[PDB]
Amino acid sequence: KTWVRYQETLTFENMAGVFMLVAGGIVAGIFLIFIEIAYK
């Protein structure tokens, strides 16, 4: 219990690049929407 027994997939993997890519798509898409507002 002093040394032997004492020692020292998930959703974090499939969220980071997806969140950053959707965030970059939103940042590009807002500018494209303002270009379309300037078009109409």
Partner 1 sequence: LASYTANLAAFMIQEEFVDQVTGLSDKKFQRPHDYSPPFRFGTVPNGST
Q: Is 9 in the site for partner 1 (CB under 8 A)?
A: yes
Q: Would you say 2 or 11 has its CB closer to partner 1? A: 11
Q: Would you say 8 or 13 has its CB closer to partner 1? A: 13
Interacting residues with partner 1 between 13 and 32 (CB under 8 A): 14
CA 3, 5, 11 angle in degrees (round to 5)? Answer: 115
Q: Is 34 in the site for partner 1 (CB under 8 A)?
A: no
User: Distance of CA 40 to CAs 12, 26, 32, 34, Å?
Assistant: 41, 20, 12, 10
